[PDB]
Design a protein around this ligand. Structure first.
Ligand SMILES: CCCCCCCCCCCCCCCCCC(=O)OC[C@H](COP(=O)(O)OCCN)OC(=O)CCCCCCCCCCCCCCCCC
Ligand SMILES: CCCCCCCCCCCCCCCCCC(=O)OC[C@H](COP(=O)(O)OCCN)OC(=O)CCCCCCCCCCCCCCCCC
Ligand code: SF4
Lengths: 106, 320, 149, 100, 176, 200
């Protein structure tokens, strides 16, 4: 249908214009206007752990996203399976909170 | 009109409508920046143009004609890319928002998944800004803000899984058509609350702004940015608020479904209410401690989103 | 550690001495240039001992907490040299003298009456509270007992 | 239509490039980065195969693959942190005490 | 579809080469993200809409974020290794490159001899994948949770800090 | 209106010139409209960086009732005494700002050293930093800063700075405005009687 072809072109133009608009504003800032002639330390792994926890939970959420779009088709069996999955996720979350791995302040 | 064909005009009118949506969104975000500043002043009991409306235009001219500057010891590519990501992340996510019947840039099957894809890439703006700045203190602030975001980006999608479950689809139009009778604000209330909390956190708006307040060794990932590059982050935030607001309308408030006013008017009406709801929130909300925001995202919102989805599934399968 | 506290460490001469000129000398761009460089090279040319501090378990980070327009609370703008072990303070040395206006030297260039304006500028938030101790002391020198009103 | 062979060759090129990266780089970070290219290339091949056969199994295998990549990168970067915290050096050639 | 497959397929190979040969760690990760976005386009061109999104949501929006976090945390880059640029020295990469080239040649030969009716591109939806995940592949999803749990437990055990404080000093053997 | 050309601080090119735009050779109605638009945006978007020194900063915060980075600031308000140890700091902060930039000296001290002509004070910030507006007072009333900002807006609306750094004349033409003292001499001298210093 011409509708899907039209929407394909519209999406492409929107993306090209959006990124083009940002570049235009940036290149304008660079050109428009005058200009004057003119190791020992590290961050705590608490930053990594938050990111690592995010990665693990985000990958776990992928399965729940696929289930969400197909809950009725999967039926109650699927519900029981997802329930076990969510329980394991919550159990690990409880472990992280109880071991204090989820408290920014010491 | 010789080359013009009934099909060509369809593939031309559609492109025009998409450009219109893009322009209106960027305009709305910029205007809100001004509209807010003024309203906040009214709340605090305190002009360039019509009610100060031209202040927005004045700022743009100043930022455009301001000397552009990249720190001598800063990765130019990463330093320049950060503002770009901040501006062209949630803006691209608006392609899935159906503003009215016959007005949607992209009716994608992935639907809401596209917003999550763009929201996921937005974190790099904060990280790249901090690393490129070359300011040790900026890096710490960027890392604090990035960790805060991931603590809210974790349940962002899960907050919308109850809506997807009821609709049985990620397509936004299907989600709107599924709110014909009852808007998802009522059945998926916990989802609405959690999504709102995550959405403002993703847009780095109050109270998830200033994540470097407690640390004296942290400054901010915008300290070295100046001129348009500094403005791109500011505008990006407001464009993101508009995108989130328009998603809430589409996901929890029936989208353009309203009793009498034209469909588009409803969409705007509701989106404006959400855009101003965030404004009421900014004034009437004390900023919690970095520790509190980190804990609230992992210990309260994440569990709740996981429970809402399971309960929604039980009710759906029971009614079937 | 007997080092200058109010004047730059490179300052030549002792200001409150009688033979020392009180009024300001001609501005020298060169000195500002050099002063600016020394400031830019401070981190490279930092020695803890110069500030009275000693390196200990090592890896300890010496840092300069600037408390000016970054954290301004009408307290003024100064800096504290912080020796840290992570976020804990092992030792700190407040660097002062950045707001020295030679008020005590001015007392020797102003009459007992023409100095009153300067008293109020020792603690700006106090106003008349700063001139009370001065007028009362001058009145003791004059032998004056002020009326009840 | 895309030739199945073209898709499989794309994956093979990205796999061999990732392996070359893992062997020529002494930095543990670039070695971990090279492994991500290799596992992504293997996941791409499953998607190409599943698409040729019109089966969801290709995407199901991709999900299992990205799950391992997430878990492997998590543990991998944790060991990199420990090595940096204790030896302040990411040259894998230095991690070669046990031999013979 | 054809343009998307070849253009994205090429953007990926070029970016991947820049990643393995780069000196700056963050730039290498940037080219790696670019290659992941290119592979996502290849997935979408083949009809794998679910895999497509996950390629940007989990690989370029989570796994890569973690990598950048580590590079920014340990201030990586400018190390003697990345200054010596040994990998660029021909005597260091010629041998590895030849082994990889021969492996590619042998693999490509096997691929060129396979039946190829062509990939149509009919979109396989996330709903279909979810029915499979919570249907025939149920044990996989349940055991995948245990795999990610193992990653969480191990990464916490070896990744946790013994010294408190957001900013820490690099000491030999992390002496406290 | 005559202009002072700062082509490409105590010593620098300061040639008195005529309106560069009015000059016929470089006279373009479009170019003039562009200059006015830029001047309008800059005068109506002066983001400030208040360097807090001594007691004047306290009066400034009363007026306030922030571009924490000099990079995002268009105006540096020097409010306080220019102490010897502080002078290098002031110069560095001003040198960390981008064009166009303006400086308002608030207070007798920042203006000329004020009552502090002592060994530890620079007699005026205009000894090392170019100043655009001087605010007399000690401390100047909060409302006085507002008048200074309005005076700067007027001066900014008359400037002829390069519209682009790649084409045209890269010279900053600042208008030689009429002194406020002469402008309001008439009303001031006309004053006859004032309230007796006896009532509140
Ligand atoms: C670069 C600029 C061009 C990008 C591509 C524009 C055209 C996209 C397009 O045609 O979409 C193809 C496909 C259609 O999906 P749908 O509309 O749901 O129809 C399903 C039945 N064919 O939809 C898809 O599969 C595309 C979905 C993802 C689009 C990603 C766009 C870029 C995101 C990252 C930016 C950084
Ligand atoms: C620089 C950027 C280069 C990007 C190259 C790839 C995009 C090229 C432009 C869009 C191509 C769209 C196209 O060919 O048509 C849509 C196509 C098929 O859509 P379908 O509805 O199934 O069938 C329609 C009739 N053929 O849809 C598809 O099969 C492809 C869908 C995904 C298209 C690409 C998505 C974004 C990729 C970004 C890569 C960025 C790398 C850096
Ligand atoms: S001018 Fe007067 S009030 Fe202002 S800082 Fe100097 S002494 Fe204080």
């Amino acid at each position: 249908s011409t509708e899907v072809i039209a929407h394909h072109w519209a999406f492409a133009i929107f993306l090209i214009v959006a990124i083009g608009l940002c570049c235009l504003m940036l290149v304008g800032g660079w050109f428009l206007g005058g200009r004057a002639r003119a190791a020992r330390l590290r961050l705590s792994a608490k930053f990594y752990l938050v990111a690592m926890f995010f990665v693990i939970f985000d990958v776990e959420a992928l399965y729940l996203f696929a289930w969400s779009t197909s809950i009725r088709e999967s039926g109650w069996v699927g519900f029981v399976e997802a329930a076990i999955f969510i329980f394991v996720l919550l159990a690990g979350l409880v472990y992280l909170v109880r071991i204090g791995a989820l408290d920014w302040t010491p | 009109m010789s080359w013009i064909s009934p099909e060509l005009i369809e593939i031309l009118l559609t492109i025009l409508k998409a450009v219109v949506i893009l322009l209106v969104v960027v305009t709305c975000g910029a205007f809100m920046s001004f509209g807010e500043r003024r309203l906040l002043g009214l709340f605090q009991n305190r002009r360039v143009g019509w009610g100060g409306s031209l202040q927005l235009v004045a700022d743009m001219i100043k930022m455009f004609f301001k000397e552009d500057w990249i720190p001598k010891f800063s990765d130019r590519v990463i330093f320049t890319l950060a503002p770009m990501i901040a501006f062209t992340s949630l803006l691209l996510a608006f392609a899935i928002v159906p503003v009215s019947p016959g007005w949607v840039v992209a009716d994608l099957n992935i639907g809401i998944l596209f917003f999550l894809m763009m929201a996921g890439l937005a974190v790099y703006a904060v990280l790249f800004a901090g690393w490129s700045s070359n300011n040790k203190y900026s890096l710490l602030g960027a890392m604090r803000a990035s960790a805060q975001t991931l603590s809210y980006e974790v349940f962002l999608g899960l907050s919308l899984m109850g809506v997807v479950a009821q609709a049985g689809s990620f397509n936004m139009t299907d989600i709107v058509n599924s709110q014909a009778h009852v808007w998802n604000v009522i059945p998926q209330f916990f989802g609405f609350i959690t999504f709102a909390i995550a959405g403002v956190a993703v847009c780095h708006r109050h109270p998830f702004d200033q994540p470097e307040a407690e640390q004296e060794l942290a400054d901010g990932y915008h300290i070295e940015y100046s001129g348009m590059k500094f403005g791109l982050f500011f505008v990006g935030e407001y464009i993101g608020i508009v995108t989130i607001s328009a998603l809430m309308v589409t996901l929890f408030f029936g989208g353009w479904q309203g009793p009498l006013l034209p469909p588009f008017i409803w969409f705007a009406l509701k989106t404006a209410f959400f855009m101003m709801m965030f404004i009421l929130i900014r004034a009437s909300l004390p900023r919690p401690r970095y520790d509190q925001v980190m804990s609230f995202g992992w210990k309260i919102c994440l569990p709740l989103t996981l429970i809402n989805l399971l309960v929604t599934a039980a009710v759906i399968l029971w009614q079937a | 550690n007997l080092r200058r506290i109010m004047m730059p460490q490179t300052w030549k001469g002792h200001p409150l001495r009688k033979d020392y000129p009180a009024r300001a000398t001609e501005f020298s761009p060169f000195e500002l240039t050099k002063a600016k460089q020394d400031l830019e090279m401070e981190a490279l040319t930092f020695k803890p001992e110069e500030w009275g501090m000693k390196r200990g378990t090592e890896n300890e980070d010496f840092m300069f907490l600037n408390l000016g327009p970054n954290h301004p609370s009408a307290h003024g703008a100064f800096r504290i040299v912080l020796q840290l072990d992570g976020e804990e303070i092992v030792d700190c040395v407040p660097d002062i003298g950045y707001h020295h206006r030679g008020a005590e030297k001015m007392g020797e260039r102003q009459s007992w009456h023409s100095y009153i304006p300067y008293t109020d500028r020792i603690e700006y938030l106090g106003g008349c509270v700063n001139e009370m101790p001065y007028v009362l002391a001058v009145e003791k020198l004059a032998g004056i007992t002020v009326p009840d009103r | 239509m895309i030739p199945l062979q073209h898709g499989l060759i794309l994956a093979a090129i990205l796999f061999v490039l990732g392996l070359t990266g893992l062997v020529i780089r002494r930095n543990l970070l670039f070695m971990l980065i090279g492994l991500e290219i290799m596992i992504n290339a293997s996941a791409l091949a499953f998607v190409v195969a599943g698409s040729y056969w019109g089966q969801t199994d290709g995407q199901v295998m991709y999900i299992l693959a990205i799950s391992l990549a997430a878990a492997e990168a998590s543990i991998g970067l944790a060991l990199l942190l420990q090595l940096h915290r204790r030896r302040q050096n990411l040259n894998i050639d230095s991690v070669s005490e046990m031999r013979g | 579809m054809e343009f998307a497959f070849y253009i994205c397929g090429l953007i990926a190979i070029l970016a991947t080469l820049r990643v393995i040969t780069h000196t700056n760690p963050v730039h290498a990760l940037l080219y790696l993200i670019i290659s992941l976005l290119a592979i996502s386009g290849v997935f979408f061109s083949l009809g794998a809409y679910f895999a497509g999104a996950l390629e940007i949501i989990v690989y370029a929006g989570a796994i890569m974020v973690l990598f950048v976090f580590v590079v920014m945390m340990l201030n990586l880059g400018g190390s003697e290794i990345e200054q010596e640029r040994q990998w660029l020295k021909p005597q260091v990469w010629i041998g590895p490159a030849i082994l990889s080239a021969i492996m590619l040649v042998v693999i490509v030969y096997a691929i060129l001899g396979v039946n190829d009716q062509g990939i149509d591109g009919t979109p396989i939806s996330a709903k279909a994948v979810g029915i499979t995940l919570f249907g025939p592949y149920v044990l996989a999803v349940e055991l995948a949770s245990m795999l990610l749990l193992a990653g969480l437990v191990v990464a916490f055990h070896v990744g946790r800090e013994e010294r408190a404080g957001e900013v820490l000093s690099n000491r030999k053997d992390d002496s406290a | 209106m005559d202009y002072t050309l700062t082509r490409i601080y105590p010593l620098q090119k300061q040639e008195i010139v005529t309106d560069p735009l009015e000059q016929e050779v470089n006279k373009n109605v479009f170019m003039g409209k562009l200059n006015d638009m830029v001047n309008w945006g800059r005068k109506n978007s002066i983001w400030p960086y208040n360097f807090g020194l001594s007691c004047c900063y306290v009066e400034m915060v009363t007026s306030f009732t922030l571009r924490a980075s000099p990079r995002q600031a268009d105006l540096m308000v020097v409010a306080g005494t220019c102490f010897t140890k502080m002078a290098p700091v002031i110069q560095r902060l001003y040198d960390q700002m981008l064009e166009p930039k303006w400086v308002i000296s608030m207070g007798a001290c920042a203006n000329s050293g004020g009552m502090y002509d002592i060994y530890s004070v620079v007699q005026g910030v205009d000894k090392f930093i170019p100043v655009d507006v001087y605010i007399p007072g000690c401390p100047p009333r909060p409302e006085a800063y507002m008048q200074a900002l309005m005076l700067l807006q007027e001066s900014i609306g008359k400037e002829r700075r390069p519209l682009s750094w790649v084409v045209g004349d890269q010279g900053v033409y600042r208008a030689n405005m009429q002194s406020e003292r002469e402008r309001k001499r008439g009303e001031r001298i006309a004053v006859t009687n004032l309230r007796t210093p006896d009532e509140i």
